[PDB]
Structure formats: structure tokens, C-alpha cells
A paper describes a structure:
Here, we have used metagenome-based technologies to identify and characterize novel bacterial lipolytic enzymes which catalyze both hydrolysis and esterification reactions at temperatures above 70°C. Metagenomic libraries from enriched soil and water samples were constructed and screening revealed two novel lipases designated LipS and LipT which showed a high temperature optimum and also a high stability against thermal denaturation. The position of the catalytic triad and the oxyanion hole (F58 and M127) at conserved topological sites clearly designates this newly characterized enzyme as a hydrolase.
Spermidine was used as an additive to improve crystal quality and was subsequently shown to inhibit the activity of LipS with its substrate pNP-decanoate in concentration dependent manner. Thus, it is likely that spermidine mimics substrate bound in the active site. At this point, there is no indication that spermidine is part of any native substrate of LipS. Furthermore, data that the inserted domain assumes the same conformation with and without bound spermidine in structures of LipS suggests that this is rather a rigid structure. Identical conformations of the lid-domain, which covers the active site, in the absence and presence of a ligand, indicate that this domain may not undergo conformational rearrangements during the catalytic cycle.
Author numbering:
A (entry chain A): 35 to 279
B (entry chain C): 34 to 279
The structure:
Amino acid sequence: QVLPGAEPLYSVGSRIGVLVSHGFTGSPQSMRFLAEGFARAGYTVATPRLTGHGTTPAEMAASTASDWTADIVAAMRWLEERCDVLFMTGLSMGGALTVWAAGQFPERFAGIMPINAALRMESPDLAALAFNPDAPAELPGIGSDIKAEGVKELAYPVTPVPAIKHLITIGAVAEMLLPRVKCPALIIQSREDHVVPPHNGELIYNGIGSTEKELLWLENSYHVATLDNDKELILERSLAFIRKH
Amino acid sequence: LQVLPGAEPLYSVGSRIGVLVSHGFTGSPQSMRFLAEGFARAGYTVATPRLTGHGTTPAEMAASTASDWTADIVAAMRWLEERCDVLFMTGLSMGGALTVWAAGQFPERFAGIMPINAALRMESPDLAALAFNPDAPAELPGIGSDIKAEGVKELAYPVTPVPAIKHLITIGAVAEMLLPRVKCPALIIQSREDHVVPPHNGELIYNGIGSTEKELLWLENSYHVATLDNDKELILERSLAFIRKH
Ligand SMILES: [Cl-]
Ligand SMILES: [Cl-]
């Protein structure tokens, strides 16, 4: 059973496609505005629901980084059916999957837009839960770090402790893949972010092999930027980035 | 399954002070045997485990994970705690990343650690592109015996099983992120020249741990599998010295 509001978005338009990925404990709700923005400009758009997300925390507890990378591949194949040119964007772990897909399939994307990508969590407490034989099954949730007032994210209200190692793994693999990324990149990072360190944007800008790259700092959003004050700016810049690459 | 000849674990019961000795990815206890026997002849209780999927077949290793390997280190820690009041841990490559992981994960538990050429950051795009690759082969060419001393052989698999690669990187990253939590005394042993794991890994550890007592020992005459190499004697001697003094 899919929680209401967490369903995936598949829209068919032109032969230019965009893959949009949400992050860890979240769902396609956090990406909907953006996804809709691209479909409305006429692009084909795949915004998958990642395995164990938008259902229950227990399901997520049993999900892995192999599932999630397979979800991105499956969405790339859906786009390659409909499309000649692909872009990918994503929030947080979705932004790490974006970097991962572009390093993994270096010739396949015309461009990427990672947003607050979670390559390095830099958290000793989080690392101390990855393989803790004495840890609770769940902690309090990671959701709704948003500057704009009265705005809600559909995400689990808790963090499933067995899934934590898989977040850290996707980030690590994406960081090591950075020099293999060569497509144009628009790296969007919140200047203040209380979930993923802002330095991740510099990390990406400084490590990729792309010759065409820009680091765009968001001044009016925290972590969930795609639902925040800068959501419209993200859409505008990303539409211009698509149009020009 | 049958354990390969030479790949048997080493367990030795001795005093109230114990040492957990961990080998690395595609390797086996044989690469740690010289060190482990040394600590046992000195009278210490010694656990040198055979990691899940290792010293059997590359197919069994393909089915083994980082949850398996950290659970192996946890059970060796439990075996030592039954027999011992004080614990140390040492290990080579992924076993040295596991040594960092256990000292960060259980910060009061160890009196000291000696990671050797610890594999926290492989810094290899080619490896990272095998981690979740839907088109990769089942096996690659092996990583075994990067050894400066001529003639010396390591008992490690002759191939790298591709699916196990994601777990190597996971352990290294979790260890790296735990570094500020490592507080016990540390002897970080690193080969100055290493064709497997970047040498800068020793600096990374030295600079990131919270330990007030720490030493970086650079090995001038060994490559990666230093526990088998020209500097093996120096490593045993300084590790025994480190144990007596902490
Ligand atoms: Cl995330
Ligand atoms: Cl290793």
C-alpha cells in the first residue's frame, strides 16, 4: 500500500527526458513541484518511488542500496524507451544517486542537477548506528528542515536504523566516482542546511571531471529546497540548464 | 564448505590481556599468522578470525556482506571478553578499517589499536564503478601479494568477486566517519609505498582520531602486505612493545 500523496510521477512529452529522485525516508512528494514544472515545459519526466519509501518504515528497514541503484537504472530504462537525451536531478541521497548515475554511465546524461547531494554526512553518531549490534530499530525523523513557514514534507516520522548503512554507502560510492562524471553539472546547495553539510556542494564542484560546471548557492532555503522559498528558482535555473545542454 | 589449507583461523588462550587480529578483503588469516603467533608466544590470548566467505571460495565471498564481517569482529570481541580483561585490536587493510570501526563503535572497550595499511579510502573510480554496476563481470583479477620481498606468497583469492566490492567501500566509509570517536591509544602503521591502498590513509587516521596518544609509523621497506614483507619483524616488535606499554 502506497501512502496517499507519495505516488511516483511518469509523464510523457518530448524526446528530452528528466529523471527526478527523492532522498532517504522521503518520497516523490518532496520532488512533485519540480517534476510537474518539467512536464509542463513539455519534457518526459520519471520521478520514481524508491523501494521501501512511501509505504512503511518496516519496509524501508528491509531495503538496500542495491534496491535504490536498481530503481534509478529501471527509471533510466523507462526514459531511454521514450527519449534520446536524459538529464537527472535529485535531492539529498537522490542528489548522491544523481552523481552516482553520471559517474557510473559517463556517456549517458546530457547534464545533472544534484541538490543538497548527501555524499558525506560527516556525522559520528550516524556512523555509530550503521552496524551497532545494540541499537534501537528506529530513531526520530529527518523530515521537514524547511525555512518557509507552514510547509510540510511527506517523509517517514522515524528513521529505520538498518537502512542507515545504505545511505552512507551510496554517498561513498558517489564521492569516489566524482572524477568519472564528465557531463555539464548544475550543483545546487543550500548555504545553510541542518541535515547535509553545505560543504558537499564544494566537494562535488571541486571533484568532478566536468569542464562545464556551476555551483549555485541557495540563500532562502534549508535542506528540503525543492519545497522551500527557492523552489521556483531551482525549477527556472534547471529549465534553462536543460534548454542549453 | 571446506576451508582451504593454510586459511584456518588462529585462537590461542593465554593471559588476561587479549589481541583481536583481523585479515582483509579477499585475504585470509594466513597473511596475519606471523603476527598472531608472535602475540601468542608472548603469552597473550589471541583471536585471529576467518571472515565470512573468506578462505573457502570466491562464490561464497560474493554472497558475504559488511553486516557479516562486522558481526565476525563482534563475535571475536565476545570470545576475547570471556577470557580477558583488556583488549587490543590490529588488522591489515579492510581488517585495519575494521580495527578503526570497532574502536569508534565501542569507544571504551579497547586499551589500544594498531591499524596496518587500513583501507578507509580506496580512492579508485574504477573500483567504485564496479560497486553497483548492472553490467559488471562476476569476477575480476585478484588484489593479492603486493609485497616488496622477492618470492613471498600470500594466501588470498586469485580473483576479486565483484558483488563483495560495495561492502569493502561501506566499511571504509563507516570507519572514516567514526574517527572523532576513537579515543584509545593508537599505533598507525602505514607503508610508505603501497600499490593497493593509498598511503595517505595513515595521515587521514592520525589527523582524524580523538586519541591523545598516537603514533604514525611509516614502513620504508614494504609494500601493501606488510605483515608478510621485509618490515614484518619491526611491526611485531613495535606492536608487542605498544601492548606492554598500554
Ligand atoms: Cl537523504
Ligand atoms: Cl582489503
